[PDB]
Amino acid sequence: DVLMTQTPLSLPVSLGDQASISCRSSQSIVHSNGNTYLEWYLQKPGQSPKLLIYKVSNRFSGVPDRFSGSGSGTDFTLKISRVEAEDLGVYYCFQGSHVPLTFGAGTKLEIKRADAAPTVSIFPPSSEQLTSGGASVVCFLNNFYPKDINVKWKIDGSERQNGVLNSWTDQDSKDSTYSMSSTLTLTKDEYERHNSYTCEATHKTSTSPIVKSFNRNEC
Amino acid sequence: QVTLKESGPGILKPSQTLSLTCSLSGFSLRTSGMGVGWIRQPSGKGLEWLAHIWWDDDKNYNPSLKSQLTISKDTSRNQVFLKITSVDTADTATYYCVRRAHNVVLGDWFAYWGQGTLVTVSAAKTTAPSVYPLAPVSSVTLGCLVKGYFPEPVTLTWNSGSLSSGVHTFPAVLQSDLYTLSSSVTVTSSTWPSQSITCNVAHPASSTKVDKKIEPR
């Protein structure tokens, strides 16, 4: 199976900027008929993928000529000279030479903007949930950039891996920031056996981790 | 005038058998060199090719899933079918059927895709969520927690939509075989808890409608 390694998996750009995406087969994809069935696809949110380029460098009907594909054999590339709003989305390169037909992972074309630290806030279990026998602590990490971030949970000082669930939003319509929500889910019994609960966030907007925590008693 | 429309059950349990259909029109896989095929994609993830059937009944499969797949066709009622046996939670995905020829004239490429159809392989039974408010321990942030509901989807607003800026409603995620989701709202401190902040939440499939005001600890 010919794996297709798109790099980078994410490409922040400005509006009207030059943008390039590498796609590299593990093996040759020149079919014995002579052709190289290397295709490029664009998927916007909520839509099915759309053909942009076929046979490496042939632009599909209706596609603006600011899209170009180049390459040969194994090393392939997609370029966009002056990036526009509508280009934003996920780009998949694809090979139709060797079965099983395969796509790359997908390079998400997202916009860049000034860096911003996340606005962390923590929330213990509410009365409602507690009288049900379950305990969840919720931590929000709002309006940050770049998209990459590390969150940790600590209970009474010790890190906690198991029983955590994360959700991230797509780049926001207005400020182009990303937001995150993390929830640590415990049994009521486990919640009331431990006291300190800490939501810790590291991001390249500080060397210090943003620490938010509470004690169950003062609740 | 050339279209592809996928039909599916919507939902079925693990270790059962998925039967998908694709209504062609504006063309026949009857015609020489014509073919139609299936490609799926789990929520927020990559594109996985499954299978392709040719005009002459030649068939192609993904090695990964050689035992589970079974593509078929029907020339004059003009339809193509795929079935996956012993399905499971990982087969939950959107399934597209797409057109592609093996000759340079009809279009040797995936130009035409159907809009798709969602199959979700769950053992879950309808379950109503528990809606919990999240009040805090210079703008103030509050939240809503909506936990353990199946199936999708729930809707959420704040003060019935009159509030909107500084709201982040997060993609839902699995916890066991139930969905949990969350939302947050941010306002200036000279607003809460001086004004009141209601979280409004629906889960049609269980007829569940909750309005949950937040209050300070």
């Binding site: 139709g96 030479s97 060797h98 | 040797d108």
Partner: peptide, 7 residues
């Protein structure tokens, strides 16, 4: 292993 295309 090769996908079918016309020569």
């Amino acid at each position: 292993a090769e996908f079918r295309h016309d020569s």
